[PDB]
Write a protein that binds this ligand. Structure first.
Ligand SMILES: Oc1ccc(/C=C/c2cc(O)cc(O)c2)cc1
Ligand SMILES: Oc1ccc(/C=C/c2cc(O)cc(O)c2)cc1
Lengths: 365, 363
């Protein structure tokens, strides 16, 4: 039934592929939580499931042969998606701890897997991953329907309150959230220092929502004669250590913003609707002197839904903001400029690509 | 360059970690009625249009619902699930999320497989089970399950799936509707492309429900009788069907006699040992020159990075989550089950559709 038959078959499978695209993520999580991913990353040869379970899991196992075959099957699936490399050797006996009698598979990390390193943020996005895949946020996403009808945030529909509020009532999730944001912050700020030339010759710099990894410490680190101001809410500022060259200030960014030669908003704007954003940015306008600058660290969705990896990641972030916040959202270049102009800024705009979909966007007074 | 490589690699990592987003966005688009509307629409349609058409319910904040739906479809479009065309607005539209720009959306070919009112060529019922939160919650318990060498389903709910289905009518319905769904499609393609029902006097379907499947088949081979074997609970609720005797019993005890036995999505539920019990019972059941016909995916011998391979290893993992020792099998492994259970070193494989093969073993 030549070619018609295959088209139909391909299409059906593509349907199924889309409906099951969660499998990859959830299998990655489980391979990380077993320590099997860390072992891949420390390895200098390919390693079988048996070898990797013995290395990753110190504990006596109640059914060790089954835990091995299960890990084998998980890694076989990842391998089919190019997450791990897989090689196959002949028996010489009968080994029971692979899912195939004839043939033992041995696995090695792909380049990408380094970004799942547990040890430390030595170039890892794992703590961020731990948040992306936490029960609490994933439950929200399964409840978008009812949230859309109500015109509400799925988070809130599902937990009966705004995520931020929720975080103060649940320390475990709070920890996860702050660790994710510190994670992202660290990678981004490191890259900023390599690629971005907007911090030079600035006498004061205000960081909004930071303090504690500060980020200003890292920056001030490379601009010794730059002073910093760490603006965030009082609850958060009441927990800040005195830091060399950094004033900590407490207060709400909707009410006021401290004066500097530049202000920094990393992953702030995208949490809020245009109306709330314009309140915020106005407060930055009144803070700033003329010739000064707001520096915005955000993704920038393209004007159109292009099928590129970069684009897809940005629209995905958009949907995370949707789920998390509702009216929080990702923005185009154009859309950001329009916010800046409402809030008083001139028609002078700078955009510099940093890393991992994040741009530094600068508005001047 | 190693700045660019590093960039790409990082974004790759984030892609991998967030690939549930597509499925869950599709689910929502389906439950809103919006996907059905795309599928019936004559031209591209905006979010506003689609919400007005799909949603009967009084909307407390209609402009927000519309922008939310726009954003969903903008994301699907970036993944080639919907087609998206963008126009300049000459006025104030706040029911799409961009001031400058209204988008309009149309179905991609793929979307027909999400059609409601289930008809001919839809896998939606099966989709609704793939994405059911009862089933999906098990995938959050793989770590601890592996350690104990348990099935994540049981780790999560404290008993095997089939027993669990007796407790939850709603999920039972989901599961039955899904299996009937896929069985219907697969049976239709079988009747087109498979010749192994020619010349069979009796066919025994094991775990085929209300006999729908035997009905469809018998419909094209009128001189073929069927026997519908399943548990008594399942059978005592199954409607009379012309030319089909319904038999109640366990396939672990025995199997009614015939010329062939059908096993659709049975074997992959079970470990090697249980499968060999079942196949042995089939061997004794069959009169000589009889066959088992196995309708299952067939994993390749190696994790090849192909769309087909991926979908079979994905099914493998579903078995792993659902049953633990349930599993997908290579040709070679199927053959070894057949040889343990007494069948000859003789094996026939016919591709059907959607990664499913008809594998035949001869007594
Ligand atoms: O792409 C697909 C993804 C998932 C499935 C599920 C199949 C399935 C089959 C069973 O016999 C039991 C079960 O609990 C699940 C099929 C196709
Ligand atoms: O691949 C991904 C890349 C980045 C993110 C970021 C998420 C995020 C979530 C929030 O609740 C607040 C926030 O300010 C950021 C999630 C997935």
């Amino acid at each position: 039934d030549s070619s018609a038959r295959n088209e139909e078959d391909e299409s059906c499978m593509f349907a199924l592929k889309l409906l099951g695209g969660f499998a990859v993520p959830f299998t990655i999580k489980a391979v990380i939580e077993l320590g099997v991913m860390d072992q891949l990353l420390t390895a200098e040869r390919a390693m079988s499931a048996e070898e990797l379970v013995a290395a990753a899991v110190a504990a006596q196992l109640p059914r060790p042969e089954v835990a091995c075959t299960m890990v084998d099957r998980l890694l076989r699936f990842l391998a089919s998606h190019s997450v791990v490399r897989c090689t196959t050797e002949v028996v010489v006996g009968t080994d029971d701890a692979t899912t195939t009698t004839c043939c033992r598979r041995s696995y090695a990390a792909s380049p990408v897997c380094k970004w799942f390193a547990r040890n430390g943020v030595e170039d890892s996005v794992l703590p961020l991953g731990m948040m992306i895949l936490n029960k609490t946020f994933l439950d929200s996403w399964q409840n978008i329907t009812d949230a859309v009808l109500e015109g509400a945030a799925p988070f809130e529909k599902t937990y009966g309150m705004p995520m931020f509020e929720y975080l103060s009532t649940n320390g475990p999730l709070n920890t996860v959230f702050h660790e994710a944001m510190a994670n992202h912050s660290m990678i981004i700020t490191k890259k900023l220092l390599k690629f971005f030339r907007g911090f030079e010759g600035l006498d004061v710099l205000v960081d909004v929502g930071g303090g504690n990894g500060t980020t200003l410490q890292m920056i001030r680190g490379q601009y010794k004669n730059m002073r910093g101001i760490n603006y965030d809410l009082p609850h958060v500022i009441a927990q800040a250590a005195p830091v060399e060259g950094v004033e900590h200030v407490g207060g709400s960014m909707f009410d006021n913003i401290p004066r500097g030669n530049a202000v920094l908003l990393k992953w702030i704007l995208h949490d809020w609707d245009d109306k709330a954003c314009i309140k915020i940015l106005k407060n930055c306008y009144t803070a700033l002197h003329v010739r000064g600058k707001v520096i915005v660290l955000e993704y920038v969705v393209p004007d159109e839904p292009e099928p590129t990896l970069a684009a897809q990641g940005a629209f995905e972030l958009d949907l995370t903001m949707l789920v998390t916040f509702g009216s929080g959202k990702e923005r185009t270049q154009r859309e950001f400029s329009e916010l800046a102009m409402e809030a008083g800024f001139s028609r002078e705009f700078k955009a510099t690509y940093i890393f991992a979909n994040v741009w530094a966007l600068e508005f001047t007074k």
